[PDB]
């Protein structure tokens, strides 16, 4: 399916930013509008992005029907076992 | 608590009209986005960081949130109030 958790990971040092969505084409393309713009939500990323350039790369992690119940589970999931809020770009849980 | 909505600058009465799934949702967080000099319409951006605390939020139509049907008075709404020539919404 497209719906489920992904990962944005900075192909420099592998740090990534996890998070979730109905459609990962149409949320990854939400999401690099945000970057280009500088206004991603997460200033983490945005400031990697603002730093680095374009070195990231987007992959589904899990597909999975957009439960809100299953979804914040796996992205939480996803955030603890990749570390990616204290070793990442996300800047909260699900 | 969806349908139509429009984030009107009271002092020239332009318009951004928008729609959503729940108004006191969107609104929250079309504000923070301003507050963040973050809005996706850089005119409402600009008008935000120009004139301050000034806009007033509102429901223009209550309806289902139903993709085809918010699309279409989505566009009723913003030709009805000019809000893309004479309005913060981003023109065509």
Redesign the interface.
Known sequence: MKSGIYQIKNTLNNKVYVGSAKDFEKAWKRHFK?LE???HSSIKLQRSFNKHGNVFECSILEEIPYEKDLIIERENFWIKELNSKINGYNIADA
């Open positions: 945000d713009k500088g206004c």
